[PDB]
Amino acid sequence: MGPGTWENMAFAQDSSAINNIDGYLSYTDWYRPYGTSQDGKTWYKTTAMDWRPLLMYIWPSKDVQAQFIKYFVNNGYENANYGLTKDTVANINKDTNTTVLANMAQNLRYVIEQSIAANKGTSKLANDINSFAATVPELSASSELSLQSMPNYRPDKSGTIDSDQVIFVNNNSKDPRKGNTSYADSNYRLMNRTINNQAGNNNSDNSPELLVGNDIDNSNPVVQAENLNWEYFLLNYGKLMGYNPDGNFDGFRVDAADNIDADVLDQMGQLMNDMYHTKGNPQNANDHLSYNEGYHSGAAQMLNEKGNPQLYMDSGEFYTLENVLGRANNRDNIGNLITNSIVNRQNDTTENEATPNWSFVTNHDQRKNLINRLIIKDHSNIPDIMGSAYKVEYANQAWQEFYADQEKTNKQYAQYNVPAQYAILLSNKDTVPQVYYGDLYNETAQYMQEKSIYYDAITTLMRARKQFVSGGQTMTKLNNNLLASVRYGKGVVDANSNGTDKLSRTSGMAVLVGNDSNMAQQSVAINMGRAHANQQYRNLIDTTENGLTYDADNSENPAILTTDSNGILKVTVKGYSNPYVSGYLGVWVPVISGDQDVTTNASDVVANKEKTFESNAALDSHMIYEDFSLFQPEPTSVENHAYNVIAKNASLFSDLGITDFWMAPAYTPFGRSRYNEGYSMTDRYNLGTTANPTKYGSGEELANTIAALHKAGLKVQEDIVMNQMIGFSGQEAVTVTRTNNRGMQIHVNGQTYANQIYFAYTTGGGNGQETYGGKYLAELQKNYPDLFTTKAISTGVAPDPTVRINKWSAKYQNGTSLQNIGIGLAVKLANGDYAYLNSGDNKAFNTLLPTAIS
Ligand SMILES: [Ca+2]
Known part of the structure; x- marks a missing residue:
C-alpha cells in the first residue's frame, strides 16, 4: 500500500513489537507501530527503537479518550493548526460524536510526534503518559478500592491496612470475556489454616491468612518442602556459603506464626528434631531455642497439644x-x-x-x-x-x-x-x-x-x-x-x-x-x-x-x-x-x-x-x-x-x-x-x-x-519469614477478587470486583532463589526421609521435594495486598473480550487486538 494511517498498525503480532503480560495487554504499556507522522502527509517507518504508548491509540472508553485529549492539550500539546486548543477541547466528553473524537485523537498523535521530534525522544511523553494515567481511576490506585478512601477513615497505627487485599483464584476459562490464567491455578491455597484451625474445623481463634505483601501459599506441598530447604540453609549458613564455618544459626524466631498454615510449624519442629534430637532431650531442645511471634492466646493450647516444638509468645x-x-x-x-x-x-x-x-x-x-x-x-x-x-x-x-x-x-x-x-x-x-x-x-x-x-x-x-x-x-x-x-x-x-x-x-x-x-x-x-x-x-x-x-x-x-x-x-x-x-x-x-x-x-x-x-x-x-x-x-x-x-x-x-x-x-x-x-x-x-x-x-x-x-x-536465632515476600520485579496476569484479610469477598463504599485479570507483581526471588532454592532437598530426603512421607494436617499429604522453587510466581501465592496499579489496566475490546496476543508460550486464545492497531 501507499503510505498512510494504516501504519498505526502493530509492526508485528508478537512480543518483538507489542508489550504484553502473559498474552494480555496493559493500557500503560507500549508497542511499535509500523510507522508514524508529524502531519498526516509524510509517514516514516519505525526502527526497532521507536515505540509508542498504547494510550495514544487505545482507551478503555470514550470517556477516557476524551480525558486523554483534554489532558494532553492542557499539558504541552496545543496546536491551533490541528484543531487542538484549550477551548476546542474544553467541553469534549463521553457524549462527543465518535468521528470527532477519532479525528481529534489522530490530530493529537501528529502534535505528539512534533513534540517527540522537538525533544529528540520519548522521555517527556513517557512522563506525561504516567501523569495522565494517575488521574484516571481505572488506570491507577483508586479503582483497587482501598478502605483508606472511606468517609472519615481513621488511620491504623500498625502502618498497614489489613483488609486491603486481593486473592488469586483459578481461571481456566475458554470464554474471552473471562480470560484464562491457568498457569497460576492451584489445587491448594488452603487459607486461614492458622493456629487451632489447622485442620479446618476449629476457627475459635479467627486468625487471618493475610497481612501485607505477596502472601505465600504455605499449604502448597512444594512450598512446604522449600521451607525445609530454607531452614536447613539458615541452620548451616556459614558452612554452606564457605564463610565462617561456625557462622550457623541455632534456631528461629518465627515471624507471623499466627498467619501461616500451621503445618509449617509442625514441619520445622520435625526437621530440627531429625537434625538435633530435641524431643525428649531438654539439653538439645534448649540449645536450639525457637520461639513463635503471635498475639493470639489460642496458640498456647495449640503448642501444648503438639508437645511444644516452639515457645508461645x-x-x-x-x-x-x-x-x-x-x-x-x-x-x-x-x-x-x-x-x-x-x-x-x-x-x-x-x-x-x-x-x-x-x-x-x-x-x-x-x-x-x-x-x-x-x-x-x-x-x-x-x-x-x-x-x-x-x-x-x-x-x-x-x-x-x-x-x-x-x-x-x-x-x-x-x-x-x-x-x-x-x-x-x-x-x-x-x-x-x-x-x-x-x-x-x-x-x-x-x-x-x-x-x-x-x-x-x-x-x-x-x-x-x-x-x-x-x-x-x-x-x-x-x-x-x-x-x-x-x-x-x-x-x-x-x-x-x-x-x-x-x-x-x-x-x-x-x-x-x-x-x-x-x-x-x-x-x-x-x-x-x-x-x-x-x-x-x-x-x-x-x-x-x-x-x-x-x-x-x-x-x-x-x-x-x-x-x-x-x-x-x-x-x-x-x-x-x-x-x-x-x-x-x-x-x-x-x-x-x-x-x-x-x-x-x-x-x-x-x-x-x-x-x-x-x-x-x-x-x-x-x-x-x-x-x-x-x-x-x-x-x-x-x-x-x-x-x-x-x-x-x-x-x-x-x-x-x-x-x-x-x-x-x-x-x-x-x-x-x-x-x-x-x-x-x-x-x-x-x-x-x-x-x-x-x-x-x-x-x-x-x-x-x-x-x-x-x-x-x-x-x-534468625527471624524466619514465611508469610510474605515484597518487591517482586516481574508482573504476571492473575485472576483476582477483592477481599478482607481472610480472603472473603467484601464491598467498599458499595463497590467490589471478582474474577478480574490484574497485573500484579508476583515473579522473582533473585539469584539466591535460583541458586539455593531446593538445592538441599535431595540430601534432606536421603538423610531424613520421614520429612517427605509424614502427611501434613491441613492437606493430608507430605511435603513434595520433587519440584524445586527456583523462582516465585502466583501459583505459589494466596494473594497480595493492593499494589496501587489499578484494576482496569487489562485491555478489553469494545465488546468486553480481553485483548490477547497469541505468540510464544501464550496460547489461551487466538490473537485479538483493538481495531486502532491491527
Ligand atoms: Ca499468610
Missing part, C-alpha cells in the same frame, strides 16, 4: 505490664500482674506445668505502633498518611518528640515505669524474657553509639537475674496498689523450703512495685522464705525523688537490711513521680562474696518423651535479646555495620546474661520498603554482599558475627 503479659504500669491515667490494678498472663504467679511452686513461653516489655512492632500514633496525631486530615502519603520527615519529627517525651516525668506518649516493667519481666518464673535493643540504646542513632536513659536500670536487673533469680515465685499485694514478687532461690521450691542446693541460701530476690504515685509512706513486710532467716540483703535498686539509686543514696532504705528469724524483710516505701518511677520500685538480693551463677543445667531437669520445650528451671535460665529496631539507620561506615558492632561487643552480651541472640531478618531488603529492615524482602537466600550489604552488613560479616557470639557462649 505471652502477649498477655505485655498488655498487662502496659495497662498496669505504663499508662499516664486509668491504670489497671497492680494485682493484674499476678493473674493476667499465660502463667498465674500468685504462688508458682511447680515445674513442667506452665506453657513454655517468651515474654517482653517492648519489641520492634510496639515501638512502631507508638511512633505511628504520634505521626497520625501530628498530621491529621491526611487519611492516607500510613499509605502512599507517608513521609520519612514525619517519623523524624515523631522521634525528636519521643526522645524529649521519654525523659519527662509527665510523659504524653512514652511508657511510664519502664524500669519496673523490666523488674517484673526479669524476675518472673516460667518464662524466657526478651529484652529490646531500643530500651538499652537510642535506636535511631548509629548502632550502639548512644545508651538509652534506661540502660543502667535494665542492665543492673539483667546481671542480677543471672546471679540470683531461681526457685519458686510468690506475688502478693501489700496494699491496693503495691505488690512484692519474690523468688525463693535455686533449689528452694516455696516459702517453707530450707533449700536443696549449695546456692539456695545466697540466691532469690524481692521485687517491690507500686503504680500509685501518691501512695502514702508506710512500712511493709516481705516474706523472703524460711530458707532466708537472719540474712543480710543488699539494696540493689531503690526509688528517690529524682530517679533511682544503686547504692541507697537518698532513698527510704539503707544499703543493707536484715531479715528476722522467720525470713521477713521490713521495708519503707512511698509513692514517687519522676522520669523513671510513677509509683514505687525496689529490688533486694542476698549479700554475697564474688561471683554467682544460678543457671540450672538442662541435663538436671525432668525429660519427657512427649515434650520438646518444658517450662522449668533450665528453660527459665535463658534470656532472649532482640538486636534491632525498624528505625535503625543505614550505617555511615563499614565499622558501623550492626554485624561488626555486635561482633566487637560479644563479651558484653554474655556479661549481661543474654543466652539467646535474636537477629533481624537478614534477607536482601526491597529498596522502597518503609524501613529496609528485612521483612519486606526480594531474596530469601542473599543475606548481603561486601558490595551490596543489607542495612546490617554482608553475609560474610554475619557469619563472623554469629561465630563471635558462639565464642562468647551464646546461641543465635
